[PDB]
Amino acid sequence: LHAFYENNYIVPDKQGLVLDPKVGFYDKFILLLDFNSLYPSIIQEFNICFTTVQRVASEAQKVTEDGEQEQIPELPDPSLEMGILPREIRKLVERRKQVKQLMKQQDLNPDLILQYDIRQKALKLTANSMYGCLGFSYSRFYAKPLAALVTYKGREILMHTKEMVQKMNLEVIYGDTDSIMINTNSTNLEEVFKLGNKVKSEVNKLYKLLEIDIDGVFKSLLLLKKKKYAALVVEPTSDGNYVTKQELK
């Protein structure tokens, strides 16, 4: 509301994919990666906004009840000016980056460190809530076609990532929404780290604003039922040594 009122507008009045990977059991090294802010990254990358997206297509989401075929809007023209929403999201991201770079200075009073940590945490939470701002059905800015387009873009990105992982002889054992882990079938931790770094670097080549990172390493993986696994969490140290701690969920 503040952003829109700052731009001479009129505000309205007040009244997802689950993957199907291969089936198998592996007790070798398991490396886990997670995508950071998939929906905000999609919004920033493709300039999705209220003012920059029309509603004339026939894809999946918004047409009348004449059959189970409806419309998702198509991607906007790249030459179009940046929308209001991506501008705010990029402002938040840039401010968080500036704060994080400010942290790297040395000889600082602990009060400044605490304030910077609080500010960066607040920025992270505010950026994270941005997709849920529009995804809520009862939200004042509810827009079904935009949410459908964002979800479709995320699904397309996930399929492309899975195909790319399969291309480089990496077994797609499981993935979900933004967190996908791969079995390296190895024992050395340094090899797993370098393979994950290479995968992350190659992934970042496809999209500028899409970022992935290493979440955790599992020495072994054991599964019992759905949404349940037993893994040995690997904690690397400065000297290269690591500890295998069992994880149960």
Swiss-Prot record:
Quaternary structure (record): Component of the alpha DNA polymerase complex (also known as the alpha DNA polymerase-primase complex) consisting of four subunits: the catalytic subunit POLA1, the regulatory subunit POLA2, and the primase complex subunits PRIM1 and PRIM2 respectively. Interacts with PARP1; this interaction functions as part of the control of replication fork progression. Interacts with MCM10 and WDHD1; these interactions recruit the polymerase alpha complex to the pre-replicative complex bound to DNA.
Family affiliation: Belongs to the DNA polymerase type-B family.
Residues annotated with N6-succinyllysine modification: K144
Disorder cited: Pigmentary disorder, reticulate, with systemic manifestations, X-linked: An X-linked recessive disorder characterized by recurrent infections and sterile inflammation in various organs. Diffuse skin hyperpigmentation with a distinctive reticulate pattern is universally evident by early childhood. This is later followed in many patients by hypohidrosis, corneal inflammation and scarring, enterocolitis that resembles inflammatory bowel disease, and recurrent urethral strictures. Melanin and amyloid deposition is present in the dermis. Van Esch-O'Driscoll syndrome: An X-linked recessive syndrome characterized by different degrees of intellectual disability, moderate to severe short stature, microcephaly, hypogonadism, and variable congenital malformations.
Full protein stretch here: 793 to 1075 of 1462
Top-level taxonomic group: Eukaryota
Function: Catalytic subunit of the DNA polymerase alpha complex (also known as the alpha DNA polymerase-primase complex) which plays an essential role in the initiation of DNA synthesis. During the S phase of the cell cycle, the DNA polymerase alpha complex (composed of a catalytic subunit POLA1, a regulatory subunit POLA2 and two primase subunits PRIM1 and PRIM2) is recruited to DNA at the replicative forks via direct interactions with MCM10 and WDHD1. The primase subunit of the polymerase alpha complex initiates DNA synthesis by oligomerising short RNA primers on both leading and lagging strands.
The record's note on its domains: The CysA-type zinc finger is required for PCNA-binding.
Protein name per the record: DNA polymerase alpha catalytic subunit
Note: In eukaryotes there are five DNA polymerases: alpha, beta, gamma, delta, and epsilon which are responsible for different reactions of DNA synthesis.
Subcellular location: Nucleus; Cytoplasm, Cytosol
Provenance organism: Homo sapiens (Human)
